[PDB]
Amino acid sequence: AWEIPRESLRLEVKLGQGCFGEVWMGTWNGTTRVAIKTLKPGTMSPEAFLQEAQVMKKLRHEKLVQLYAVVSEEPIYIVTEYMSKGSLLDFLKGEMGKYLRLPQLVDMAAQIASGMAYVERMNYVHRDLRAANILVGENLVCKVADFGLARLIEGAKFPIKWTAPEAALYGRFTIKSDVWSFGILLTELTTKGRVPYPGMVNREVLDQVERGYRMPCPPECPESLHDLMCQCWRKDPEERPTFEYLQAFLEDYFTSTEPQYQPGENL
Ligand SMILES: N#CC[C@H](C1CCCC1)n1cc(-c2ncnc3[nH]ccc23)cn1
């Protein structure tokens, strides 16, 4: 019943293209502006492509990108709501980046924690939480997207710089490894989109994180916010905070934690 006829869709503008398929902005039933994830016909199994839609069928939250429809016969289409400002990573790196200060950045973080706390409640794992997988809409609304690797808890290698070591090394993906990634996401926000562990290659990152290395407090980031990051990067997955706590901490941040915050030059 999520099924629609393919002639119901008009693809128009390209927005991006991954190496397992493409993403277009389109029109649904001639009335609704949508986004249409397409498949590169041969890159990966059609059933592997559709599992992303399988997952999105079960999830529904204001801070997760919403599934609209599916075409499950080749060529395959996953149809979702359209996000007008593109990826958070591009937004932070773009011309808006320099004007964002801590209050807009923390509010973006709160929204992401809200969507993820919902994922937490439903017993899903995302497994690719990072700023390139968050989408920005009107009024600085942020929604988590790309549930390509997401699954209910019962590829070959993951971006180690965002992945909790137990998950990178032994495949132990839990909501607490998503919490690890959220901490790394917090450093992307507070540095306006810089790659984590500047100057370190993947192996060096792995070796040092095992030996206890953690990224320092970014310039102008408050120590209370870097404390939060460090709790997210606790070696013991179960010492890591929940998203429910993270959501509430970030929504209340400027009253309960940093009530005397003054804007600086970049944050
Ligand atoms: N690679 C490429 C995939 C791309 C990544 C960006 C966030 C999720 C993955 N992606 C963007 C979308 C999308 N969905 C809805 N509105 C949008 N606007 C711009 C991109 C976009 C879906 N996937």
Resolution (A): 2.3
Contact 150, 125 (CB under 8 A): yes
Q: Structure tokens of 97?
A: 């980046």
By most ligand atoms within 8 Å of CB, the mutation choice from 23, 27, 63 for ligand 1 is: 23
DSSP string, 198-210: TT--HHHHHHHHH
Method of structure determination: X-ray
Element housing 52 (H / E): helix 46-58
Cα separation, 41 vs 36, in Å, equals 15
Measured in angstroms, how far is the CA atom of residue 105 from the centroid of ligand 1? 20
Domains and CATH numbers, the chain: 1-82 (3.30.200.20), 83-260 (1.10.510.10)
